[PDB]
Amino acid sequence: SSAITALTPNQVNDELNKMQAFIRKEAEEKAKEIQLKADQEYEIEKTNIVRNETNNID
């Protein structure tokens, strides 16, 4: 019948949506972790370099 489907034709799209949803969720999680590490570096190496500079110049 050109469509060998045992269920309704839209549960395919519902599972499609869930699939792209978890893809987006994992992408967001990794992006947020990258942002967090970029924030913490912002402070830690800034502090290290300013400290050692300030000390030697003092």
Partner: protein, 200 residues
Amino acid sequence: DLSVRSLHDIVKPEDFVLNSEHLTTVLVAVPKSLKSDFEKSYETLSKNVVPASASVIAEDAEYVLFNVHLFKKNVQEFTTAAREKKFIPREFNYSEELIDQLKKEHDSAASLEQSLRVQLVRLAKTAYVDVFINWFHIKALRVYVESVLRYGLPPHFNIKIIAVPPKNLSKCKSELIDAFGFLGGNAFMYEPFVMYIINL
């Protein structure tokens, strides 16, 4: 059968899912009677299996080749469930060339079954020559040493070969031993004197 054998010229890339990390497609073979049952049961063998994916790829006199689009992980689960379900999924890969290499391997087999046969012929004949020469040399040394042991000081032995073609080897042996057993001694008529056989 087409499904069990190589599908090098049968299945095409469109039947597969390419350049997508999380998605793939397997090749499935359906027996004659289990078309509808599998078609209504192929999605239930693993999770994250793209439903509404059944499609005919090929068929033989006892099976109909289908395919299922599903995740990379689910391939193993679907295959094992099918195998336990008396269901055979097909085997193939995206080689894009296996067709020509396999036939070239067959042609190499056809060439070697000719070449190696002739080389074996030649080595076997030269062996049958030289080994046989060594065999007669060994028997010559055997007769010499036996004559030395049984007989006395000087070599004046009459080493002869007598061939008895028709079914008369044992009879010739009896004729020689009974008529010449004394050669080895009265009480030493094991054989009386030196004599050896060649079962050619």
